[PDB]
Design a protein around this ligand. Structure first.
Ligand code: RBT
Ligand code: MG
Ligand code: MG
Ligand code: MG
Ligand code: MG
Ligand code: MG
Ligand code: MG
Ligand code: MG
Ligand code: MG
Ligand code: MG
Ligand code: MG
Ligand code: MG
Ligand code: MG
Ligand code: MG
Ligand code: MG
Ligand code: MG
Ligand code: MG
Ligand code: MG
Ligand code: MG
Ligand code: MG
Ligand code: MG
Ligand code: MG
Ligand code: MG
Ligand code: MG
Ligand code: MG
Ligand code: MG
Ligand code: MG
Ligand code: MG
Ligand code: MG
Ligand code: MG
Ligand code: MG
Ligand code: MG
Ligand code: MG
Ligand code: MG
Ligand code: MG
Ligand code: MG
Ligand code: MG
Ligand code: MG
Ligand code: MG
Ligand code: MG
Ligand code: MG
Ligand code: MG
Ligand code: MG
Ligand code: MG
Ligand code: MG
Ligand code: MG
Ligand code: MG
Ligand code: MG
Ligand code: MG
Ligand code: MG
Ligand code: MG
Ligand code: MG
Ligand code: MG
Ligand code: MG
Ligand code: MG
Ligand code: MG
Ligand code: MG
Ligand code: MG
Ligand code: MG
Ligand code: MG
Ligand code: MG
Ligand code: MG
Ligand code: MG
Ligand code: MG
Ligand code: MG
Ligand code: MG
Ligand code: MG
Ligand code: MG
Ligand code: MG
Ligand code: MG
Ligand code: MG
Ligand code: MG
Ligand code: MG
Ligand code: MG
Ligand code: MG
Ligand code: MG
Ligand code: MG
Ligand code: MG
Ligand code: MG
Ligand code: MG
Ligand code: MG
Ligand code: MG
Ligand code: MG
Ligand code: MG
Ligand code: MG
Ligand code: MG
Ligand code: MG
Ligand code: MG
Ligand code: MG
Ligand code: MG
Ligand code: MG
Ligand code: MG
Ligand code: MG
Ligand code: MG
Ligand code: MG
Ligand code: MG
Ligand code: MG
Ligand code: MG
Ligand code: MG
Ligand code: MG
Ligand code: MG
Ligand code: MG
Ligand code: MG
Ligand code: MG
Ligand code: MG
Ligand code: MG
Ligand code: MG
Ligand code: MG
Ligand code: MG
Ligand code: MG
Ligand code: MG
Ligand code: MG
Ligand code: MG
Ligand code: MG
Ligand code: MG
Ligand code: MG
Ligand code: MG
Ligand code: MG
Ligand code: MG
Ligand code: MG
Ligand code: MG
Ligand code: MG
Ligand code: MG
Ligand code: MG
Ligand code: MG
Ligand code: MG
Ligand code: MG
Ligand code: MG
Ligand code: MG
Ligand code: MG
Ligand code: MG
Ligand code: MG
Ligand code: MG
Ligand code: ZN
Lengths: 37, 243, 621, 340, 229, 95, 229
């Protein structure tokens, strides 16, 4: 009753994320904040 | 309860043409004959060549005769009516059809003549004969001119019509479409089960599994194996989640 | 058993587009109950769930506001429809529901071919994609209007079935009527005039065998495209009539209907010129010409744009069919005048075989096998006789065009109505000595019937067997083949197979070009292992050969430049569990390369399990 | 072997009484063996229909006998074959066992007959399962009837002659599923047994002996025979058929009417005038419409519904029990505990 | 007027009773008899209003599937015969008229047996309702309305008396339409259309009336092309 | 069929990838609030009982309608797994 | 008004240029979109009378199948191009107008080259008649008339000059008509007709104008049912 090995359950695509350029600059700002003092 | 005919119902003549009602048309626009009388049912031709029962096409012809001649007949099994005898009664019918038409006061349409043009070019009527004589020929063949009804124009090329007997078939309990959302469940196997008032789920067979397997329907198949039928804790959180 | 399922009788949905399907609101309600409930609460119809529930527990209690809610819930969601035997993946397809009244389920005509589902009561089930994921896949990679080409062959499955062809055909056919006096206009100017007046008279038709132009071409010339049809509308020219017309830059001698079909496509897809490049208006549109059109359109213009053409064809085909007035008549099944000849001729010849036996010349057996040979030939003789009849005298006989057009009719079938069904076998298998002299047009006698009955049962007894046997096969195939899945990077092992374009033995030894089909089967959408320079073009390595390419290689083998073809294949793959892009090829249901993650194993196992139902079944070993 | 009556309509319920099967006692032909039995053996002539049988894994094992087929002394269907001594044909008939049929040269009924004289020198006959063109002098026996070759259910087909035996089956089984319509009509073209079906089946009510009619109720026709007696003939008003189809006997005779012996007093569930009547003759055009009639779809004129043409009465039988639970008897009262 | 306008559609009419009415009109240009006859037909069948039995109440009968003693016909056969009944009221003031009838004993019940109502007339007097034997008690109230088209007894569900039973609505007064376009020769040119349409009517309205209503519905519709947007 | 399904298919390396993208985009479109879109102003998603599709009919019909534009970005490993859900909650209201 | 009358055909229009013009109108009862669209169509094509080249006379040419020196095009190709010519006269006084044109030598003959006529205008100036080389002499008289529908050159047989050749009559500003009847859902009942007809026009008149003329011809014809006889 596990997901099928063949199809959208492909190890090649099971993992794929999506982004908005707005959320792209948001995450890099999180990296900018990493600069201490 | 009264069961008036409807789009879900299936009718079929004694020959074997079986089939379902797909559309109930308003008398307003279905095929109508020269004299205002319109057709009740329109049977597809294509269903006749492949199958091999011209017997129906023979019935409709003798029928056309019985309609205008106001008479019923008895054609035995293999000894019955013969192609010439029918053409003979059709001949008698042409007079009741078109004879009254002569006396009632009118002749032939632009339409009636037009379809004749296309009919001679076809090869159904001996070129050079008068429309009156031509229509007799064309009628004897078992077809008559028909106008659209929706446009009032004619249907290029004679079409046969006639009195065919058709029965209506009994609706089995399965007919009653079974649509189930959520319902009982078997005690030992935890798969959906119906009975009295809850419809009972449909079976997802291997042949059907593969169908999904072939597609990239990963989740859609998991669902069919989990959320929809056996995942006890799944279907529960499933419903509520949907809710 | 699935939790969100349903099942009811199906019914043809002519206006419906491939995209959608008619679903009974009554069913949709139960199906999408929970989706509705919540939607009730978002609107004023109900305070809460439990409320929304009791609000629907009885039929008389539904406010017309609920339908509007459900119709809103179903906006862009889609469902799955299944058929009785799910033989291949197209056995389940997704469509957008268009809620409708009553009990029946409205199905599109075009996909009635994928599901072997006719309308004599066949019922189809229906399931619901609940996750946004399942819905995503369902409508992306499972939707009907997307999966147009078969996984078995790169041939379309969205082919205009029976009624559409019949329509589209009748519109594009040309007619020929009476040849009496001279047919020579190619040369004299007194020929134009004389046979123009002669035609006005009663001797020359508008469609006469007169090489260059039958007077039907002489009389009418149409400037712009439209001009043509207007004359048709006014009753000047029938659609099947031979006329001349001015198109983009050519004076083209083509019929009205043909010119109209041209537009239908030209309109479906507005690249008018691209519409002309992929169409053959030089012939009546058979299912094959159409099939072809579809394919071409798919490769050329793009998937959805094809879909449009599909429905466009479906629509006019349907319409034009109604007006054509093609019908089945008893006098339409025409028996040849030659039937009596062929019969009697073969009749007397039987008498000779008998006299030859009465004397002691031919053995008990010789007689038997000699008689059957007599009829086997005679019967085939009447067959080509009836067709020749229709072919020469009645081009537009009902029973004929249907069979010619990819529509409906089997040569062998026609023979049983017009000519005669001749030889039926005894119970065991030894064919009967006497034939069935009759056709279906005339009384199949009392006994020639009982005789034919035997062979009927065997066909039926067999059908009952492949129903569960065709499965016998597919089971096996899927048990072995399931694990096979496309998961890759171009497998680096280049071990390849060479496809033969030539076969050594039909007649002992003579080298001949393989059938245009078998070859297609071999190299269509394959990946060249090594480079091949053939007629002038350089097929590069690894390139996927399109049907157009596999049409080149054959034209080349015709010329004599290649006898084999280097190509990647599953038989030589390196990926243990799995097959790769370059080794599988093209054919996803789509015509581009295969997409990683396709479950080939089954796709394969299936294409093989279904046709198997058509293969004979006497004894396994 | 004992089954629910097939009362979808008298016809159907009748055949169901004359259907023969394979499977059963287990001791005889069970599930395994098949194709030799399932096939229509030569001898099945006038003894078993070759069209009749079902469609599926269970094929040919279950089939109803033929028209003139009769079980003689021990279950051996003997089909009737009339005698023809020399070139002379008789009106005498011999119900022949399967076996004896082979010892003779038998001819078909289609043979041009002047009465007792055969009319064509080379006329068809079939010795033993083999089609043979025999002479008038060899014709020992002749086929009794074109009807005996098949079953009742099949005999009802108009021009069976021009229809593929394969699809003729469909037609035969289709009638078995015919539902009685409040408005019944006989075919515009019939074969000749419609009358005999309704009469031999027990649809319509026939007059015993000659007389006159006394009262014509909607529930009873008390006729008065000339013998000085009068009997009340109740009419199953509205009864429930096993499969839910109406069975009503509608009186066709008016008050005070001299009846011939054996004439319809009332019509059966599906009879118009003593004639079998299912479905209803309808004028029909045979052309293509948009797609409304595409593979096997039928377009219908609303006008057919205006008139109560295709309309049928149904009746389901819902049933509930008051059970005794250890928790307390289940009472049946107007009391519905929670809301309205 | 004298030339092209005097040469105008000669509207001729031939009508016997309120059922049949022939209507000829010629000359007409090219292919117009069809242009006109067809739409009018489409209207004459769908668009025009009439009368039909909308509900029935036998006094001792509760459901539609019952049988009354002393009464040969069954409730369903009778309610059926009523659909056959054609009535005609004279003015809008009559929307729903309840016709009453009660007959007993050895008499045949025809439609003439209904007690007369002031503004309503029954064109179907001799129609056969039932055959009563002896001790035959039939007392009923049959509703009648003015509507359009076909309305299933299920769609309306009329409620005069709780034990009453609705009936199907056969409202088109027009039974059948029929038009012929035969050539007519007027001097100069032969191609001429002569349109003659034959209309049949249940009696409620007349062929002429019907036709007039018809053409207006068309006219009214042709006006709906006024305000662009 | 569906809008530029070809165009879509072309924007991915694998057919089955496009399905995962659209599906996951539709997911986020709803969860973090449905105004998490990149193309709402002038010509956008629309239904007709009113023009009300602008709020919440079909999730992915949006996802697709955006992916067809060149504003979104789908990668194998574009933005670290857990930090994404955090920044998305921080910036998109509607709950 | 509010209920049945406010629920009225919403006439909506979409027209770009004078050639194309869509026209939507809903709701409509049962099967009316058809009842309306069809007749309008039949009118829009035949009735909106128009103009078309009815006859031609090249001065040295005798038959239609000839070729003129210095003239690339053949008589048949040119008489064909003339059918393409669209003219427009302003009043009834102009029934048959003969347009004249004569051009010589290395010039291209376009429709603007025809000598202007007082009450007549040529909307098709740049249309291409012929390409004259050198010593190219083309002097012709092309007739023009006001008629309706399609009239084969054989049917009329015009006789201005004995060596002249008749042409087929393309009498209509309307190029093509097209109507669709798709379902529309209005609250209660779903069965609804939505009629939308697309009209194309050569430019002489506009789709809207045409449509208006059309409906009137119908209206005018519906009045012809006035005086019985
Ligand atoms: C002795 O009562 C039962 C024995 C079963 O056991 C089996 C193992 O022995 C059988 C024997 C000895 C038979 O002669 C038949 C069948 C079976 C069995 O299956 C059939 N079986 C089927 C084949 C396919 N299945 C579907 C299954 C796969 C899920 C449905 C039935 N049809 C069957 C028949 N039909 C026909 O001839 C046809 C072509 C039509 C007639 C139809 C009417 C409508 C029926 O006659 C109805 C009035 C009723 O009689 C039956 C429904 C009955 O049920 C009851 C409760 O009475 C069974 C016959 C049979 O003549
Ligand atoms: Mg996932
Ligand atoms: Mg993101
Ligand atoms: Mg900071
Ligand atoms: Mg610092
Ligand atoms: Mg700092
Ligand atoms: Mg019902
Ligand atoms: Mg009449
Ligand atoms: Mg009559
Ligand atoms: Mg008989
Ligand atoms: Mg005669
Ligand atoms: Mg007379
Ligand atoms: Mg008359
Ligand atoms: Mg007269
Ligand atoms: Mg033709
Ligand atoms: Mg003649
Ligand atoms: Mg339900
Ligand atoms: Mg339920
Ligand atoms: Mg529950
Ligand atoms: Mg869960
Ligand atoms: Mg459509
Ligand atoms: Mg539809
Ligand atoms: Mg409540
Ligand atoms: Mg409701
Ligand atoms: Mg709303
Ligand atoms: Mg079925
Ligand atoms: Mg099924
Ligand atoms: Mg989800
Ligand atoms: Mg594949
Ligand atoms: Mg096919
Ligand atoms: Mg021809
Ligand atoms: Mg000759
Ligand atoms: Mg000729
Ligand atoms: Mg050219
Ligand atoms: Mg474009
Ligand atoms: Mg070519
Ligand atoms: Mg093919
Ligand atoms: Mg492509
Ligand atoms: Mg012959
Ligand atoms: Mg002869
Ligand atoms: Mg001979
Ligand atoms: Mg030979
Ligand atoms: Mg052969
Ligand atoms: Mg031959
Ligand atoms: Mg010939
Ligand atoms: Mg041909
Ligand atoms: Mg023919
Ligand atoms: Mg076949
Ligand atoms: Mg055997
Ligand atoms: Mg043997
Ligand atoms: Mg015969
Ligand atoms: Mg086996
Ligand atoms: Mg199987
Ligand atoms: Mg097996
Ligand atoms: Mg690489
Ligand atoms: Mg390497
Ligand atoms: Mg080989
Ligand atoms: Mg060979
Ligand atoms: Mg071959
Ligand atoms: Mg190398
Ligand atoms: Mg090399
Ligand atoms: Mg080359
Ligand atoms: Mg080279
Ligand atoms: Mg190179
Ligand atoms: Mg490479
Ligand atoms: Mg190529
Ligand atoms: Mg080649
Ligand atoms: Mg070659
Ligand atoms: Mg494969
Ligand atoms: Mg198959
Ligand atoms: Mg074989
Ligand atoms: Mg065994
Ligand atoms: Mg054996
Ligand atoms: Mg035999
Ligand atoms: Mg059976
Ligand atoms: Mg012996
Ligand atoms: Mg002789
Ligand atoms: Mg024998
Ligand atoms: Mg059979
Ligand atoms: Mg009795
Ligand atoms: Mg008396
Ligand atoms: Mg008597
Ligand atoms: Mg009728
Ligand atoms: Mg209990
Ligand atoms: Mg309360
Ligand atoms: Mg008068
Ligand atoms: Mg009179
Ligand atoms: Mg009269
Ligand atoms: Mg016309
Ligand atoms: Mg009492
Ligand atoms: Mg009662
Ligand atoms: Mg009635
Ligand atoms: Mg009134
Ligand atoms: Mg008024
Ligand atoms: Mg009393
Ligand atoms: Mg009484
Ligand atoms: Mg009425
Ligand atoms: Mg009528
Ligand atoms: Mg009538
Ligand atoms: Mg005059
Ligand atoms: Mg004259
Ligand atoms: Mg009115
Ligand atoms: Mg007004
Ligand atoms: Mg305004
Ligand atoms: Mg505007
Ligand atoms: Mg606007
Ligand atoms: Mg690209
Ligand atoms: Mg890649
Ligand atoms: Mg948008
Ligand atoms: Mg609204
Ligand atoms: Mg708004
Ligand atoms: Mg708003
Ligand atoms: Mg926060
Ligand atoms: Mg209203
Ligand atoms: Mg503009
Ligand atoms: Mg302008
Ligand atoms: Mg334009
Ligand atoms: Mg345009
Ligand atoms: Mg309609
Ligand atoms: Mg029209
Ligand atoms: Mg003008
Ligand atoms: Mg000369
Ligand atoms: Mg000069
Ligand atoms: Mg110059
Ligand atoms: Mg200008
Ligand atoms: Mg030039
Ligand atoms: Mg002049
Ligand atoms: Mg047009
Ligand atoms: Mg349309
Ligand atoms: Mg339509
Ligand atoms: Mg106006
Ligand atoms: Mg005015
Ligand atoms: Mg008057
Ligand atoms: Zn590989």
């Amino acid at each position: 009753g596990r997901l099928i090995p063949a199809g959208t359950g492909s190890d090649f695509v099971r993992f794929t994320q999506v982004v908005d350029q707005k959320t792209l600059k948001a995450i890099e700002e999180a990296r900018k904040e990493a600069v201490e003092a | 309860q009264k069961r008036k005919l409807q789009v879900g119902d299936k009718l079929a003549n004694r020959h074997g043409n079986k089939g379902v009602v797909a559309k109930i048309l308003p008398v307003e626009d279905m095929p109508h004959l020269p004299d205002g009388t319109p057709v009740d049912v329109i049977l597809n031709p294509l269903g006749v060549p492949s199958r091999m029962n011209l017997g129906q096409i023979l019935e409709t012809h003798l029928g056309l005769a019985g309609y205008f001649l106001g008479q019923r007949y008895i054609s035995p099994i293999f000894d019955g009516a013969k192609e010439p005898e029918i053409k003979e009664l059709l001949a008698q019918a042409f007079e009741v059809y078109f004879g009254k038409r002569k006396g009632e006061g009118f002749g032939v349409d632009k339409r009636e003549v037009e379809v004749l043009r296309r009919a001679e070019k076809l090869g159904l009527v001996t070129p050079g004969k008068t429309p009156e004589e031509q229509l007799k020929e064309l009628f004897l063949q078992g077809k008559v001119v028909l106008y659209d009804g929706r446009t009032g124009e004619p249907i290029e090329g004679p079409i046969v019509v006639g009195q065919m007997f058709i029965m209506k078939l009994y609706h089995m309990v399965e007919d009653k479409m079974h649509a189930r959302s959520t319902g009982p469940y078997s005690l030992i196997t935890q798969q959906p089960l119906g009975g009295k008032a809850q419809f009972g789920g449909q079976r997802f067979g291997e042949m059907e599994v593969w169908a999904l397997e072939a597609y990239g329907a990963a989740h859609t198949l998991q669902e069919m194996l989990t959320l929809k039928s056996d995942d006890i804790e799944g279907r529960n959180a499933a419903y509520e989640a949907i809710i | 058993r699935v939790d969100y399922s349903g099942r009811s009788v199906i019914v043809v949905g002519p206006q419906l587009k491939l995209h959608q399907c008619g679903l009974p609101k009554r069913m949709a309600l139960e199906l999408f109950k929970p989706f509705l409930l919540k939607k009730m609460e978002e609107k004023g119809i109900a305070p809460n769930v439990k409320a929304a529930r009791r609000m629907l527990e009885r039929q008389r209690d539904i406010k017309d506001e609920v339908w509007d809610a459900l119709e809103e819930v179903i906006h862009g969601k889609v469902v799955l429809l299944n058929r009785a035997p799910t033989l291949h993946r197209l056995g389940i397809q997704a469509f957008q529901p268009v809620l409708v009244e009553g009990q029946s389920i409205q199905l599109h005509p075009l996909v009635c071919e994928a599901f072997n589902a006719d309308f004599d009561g066949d019922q189809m089930a229906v399931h619901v994609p609940l996750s946004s994921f399942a819905q995503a896949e369902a409508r992306i990679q499972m939707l009907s209007a997307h999966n147009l080409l078969s996984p078995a062959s790169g041939e379309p499955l969205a082919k205009p079935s029976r009624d559409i062809i019949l329509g589209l055909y009748y519109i594009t056919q040309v007619r020929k009527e009476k040849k009496g006096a001279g047919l020579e206009f190619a040369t004299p100017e007194e020929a134009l005039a004389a046979h123009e007046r002669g035609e006005v008279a009663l001797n020359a038709p508008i469609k006469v065998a007169g090489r260059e132009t039958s007077v039907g071409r002489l009389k009418y010339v149409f400037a712009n495209p439209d001009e043509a049809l207007l004359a048709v509308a006014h009753g000047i020219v029938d659609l099947q009539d031979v006329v001349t017309v001015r198109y983009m830059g050519k004076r083209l001698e083509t019929s009205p209907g043909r010119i109209l079909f041209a537009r239908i496509v030209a309109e479906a897809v507005e690249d008018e010129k691209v519409a002309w490049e992929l169409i053959q208006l030089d012939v009546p549109q058979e299912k094959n010409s159409l099939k072809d059109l579809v394919y071409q359109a798919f490769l050329r213009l793009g998937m959805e744009k094809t879909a449009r053409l599909l429905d466009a064809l479906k629509y006019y085909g349907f319409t034009f069919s109604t007006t054509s007035g093609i019908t089945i008549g008893i006098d339409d099944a025409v028996i040849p005048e030659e039937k009596k000849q062929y019969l009697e001729e073969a009749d007397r010849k039987l008498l000779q075989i008998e006299q030859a036996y009465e004397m002691g010349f031919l053995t008990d057996r010789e007689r038997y096998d000699q008689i059957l040979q007599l009829w086997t030939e005679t019967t085939e003789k009447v067959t080509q006789a009836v067709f020749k009849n229709f072919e020469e005298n009645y081009p537009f006989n009902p029973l004929y065009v249907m069979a010619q057009s990819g529509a409906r009719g089997n040569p062998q079938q026609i023979r049983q109505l017009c000519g005669l069904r001749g030889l039926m076998q005894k119970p065991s298998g030894e064919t009967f000595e006497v034939p069935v002299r009759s056709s279906f047009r005339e009384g199949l006698t009392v006994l020639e019937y009982f005789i034919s009955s035997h062979g009927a049962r065997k066909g039926g007894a067999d059908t009952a067997l492949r129903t569960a046997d065709s499965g016998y096969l597919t089971r096996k195939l899927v048990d072995v083949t399931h694990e096979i899945v496309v998961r890759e990077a171009d497998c680096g092992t280049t071990n390849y197979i060479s496809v033969p374009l030539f076969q050594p033995d039909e007649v002992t030894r003579s080298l001949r070009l393989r059938k245009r089909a078998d070859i297609e089967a071999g190299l269509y959408g394959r990946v060249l292992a090594r480079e091949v320079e053939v007629l002038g073009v350089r097929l590069e390595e690894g390139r996927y050969l399109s049907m157009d390419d596999v049409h080149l290689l054959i034209k080349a083998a015709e010329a004599g430049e290649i006898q084999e073809v280097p190509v990647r294949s599953p038989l030589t793959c390196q990926t243990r569990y799995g097959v790769c892009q370059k080794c599988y090829g093209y054919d996803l249901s789509m015509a581009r390369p295969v997409s990683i993650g396709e479950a080939v194993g089954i796709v394969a196992a299936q294409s093989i399990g279904e046709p198997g139902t058509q293969l004979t079944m006497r004894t396994f070993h | 072997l004992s089954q629910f009556k097939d009362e979808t309509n008298p016809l159907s319920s009748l055949r169901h009484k004359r259907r023969i099967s394979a499977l059963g006692p287990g001791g005889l032909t069970r599930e395994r063996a098949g194709f030799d039995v399932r096939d229509v053996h030569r001898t099945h002539y006038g003894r078993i229909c070759p069209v009749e049988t079902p469609e599926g894994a269970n094929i040919g094992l279950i089939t109803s006998l033929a028209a003139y087929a009769r079980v003689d002394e021990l279950g051996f269907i003997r089909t009737p074959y009339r005698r023809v001594v020399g070139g002379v044909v008789t009106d005498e008939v011999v119900y022949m066992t399967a076996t004896e049929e082979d010892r003779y040269t038998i001819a078909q009924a289609n043979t041009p007959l002047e009465g007792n004289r055969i009319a064509a020198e080379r006329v068809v006959a079939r010795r033993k399962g083999e089609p043979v063109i025999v002479s008038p002098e060899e014709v020992e026996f002749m086929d009794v009837s074109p009807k005996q070759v098949f079953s009742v259910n099949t005999n009802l087909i108009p021009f069976l002659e021009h229809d593929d035996a394969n699809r003729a089956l469909m037609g035969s089984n289709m009638q078995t599923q015919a539902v009685p319509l409040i408005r019944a009509q006989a075919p515009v073209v019939m074969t000749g047994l419609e009358e005999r079906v309704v009469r031999d089946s027990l649809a319509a009510l026939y007059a015993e002996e000659d007389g006159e009619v006394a009262k014509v109720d909607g529930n009873r026709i008390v006729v008065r025979y000339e013998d000085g007696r009068l009997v009340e003939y109740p009419l199953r008003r509205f009864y429930r058929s096993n499969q839910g189809t109406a069975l009503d006997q509608r009186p066709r005779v008016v008050v005070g009417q001299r009846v011939r012996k054996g004439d319809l007093l009332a019509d059966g569930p599906a009879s118009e005038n003593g004639f079998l009547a299912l479905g209803q003759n309808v004028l029909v055009a045979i052309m293509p419409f948009d797609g409304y009639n595409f593979e096997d779809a039928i377009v219908i004129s609303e006008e057919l519904l205006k008139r109560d043409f295709y309309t049928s009465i149904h009746i389901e039988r819902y049933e509930i029990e008051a059970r005794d639970t250890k928790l307390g008897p289940e009472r049946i009262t107007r009391d519905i505990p929670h809301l309205s | 007027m004298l030339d092209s306008k005097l040469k105008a559609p000669v509207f001729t009419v031939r009508t016997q009773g309120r059922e049949y009415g022939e209507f000829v009109l010629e000359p007409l240009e090219r292919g117009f008899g069809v242009t006109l006859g067809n739409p009018l037909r489409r209207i004459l069948l769908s668009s025009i209003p009439g009368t039909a039995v909308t509900s029935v109440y036998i006094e001792d009968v509760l459901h539609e599937f019952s049988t009354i003693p002393g009464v040969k016909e069954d409730v369903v056969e009778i309610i059926l015969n009523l659909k056959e009944l054609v009535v005609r009221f004279l003015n809008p003031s009559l929307q729903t008229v309840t016709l009453l009838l009660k007959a007993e004993g050895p008499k045949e019940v025809k439609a003439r047996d209904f007690l007369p109502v002031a503004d309503v007339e029954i064109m179907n007097p001799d129609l056969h309702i039932a055959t009563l034997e002896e001790g035959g008690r039939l007392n009923m109230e049959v509703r009648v309305d003015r509507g359009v088209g076909y309305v299933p007894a299920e769609k309306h569900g009329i409620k005069d008396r709780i034990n009453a039973i609705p009936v199907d609505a056969v409202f088109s007064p027009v039974r059948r339409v029929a038009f012929q376009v035969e050539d007519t020769r007027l001097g100069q040119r032969t191609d001429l259309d002569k349109l003659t349409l034959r209309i049949w009517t249940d009696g409620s309205v007349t062929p002429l009336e019907a036709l007039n209503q018809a053409v207006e519905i068309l006219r009214e519709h042709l006006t709906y092309f006024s305000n662009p947007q | 069929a569906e809008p530029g399904i070809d165009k879509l298919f072309g924007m991915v390396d694998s057919k089955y990838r496009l399905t995962v993208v659209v599906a996951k985009r539709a997911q986020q479109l709803l969860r973090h609030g449905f105004k998490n879109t990149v193309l709402e102003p002038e010509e956008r998603p629309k239904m007709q009982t009113l023009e009300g599709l602008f709020d919440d009919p079909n999730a992915e019909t949006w996802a697709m309608k955006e992916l067809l534009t060149g504003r979104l970005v789908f990668g194998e490993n574009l933005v670290p797994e857990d930090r994404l859900q955090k920044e998305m909650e921080r910036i998109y209201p509607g709950e």
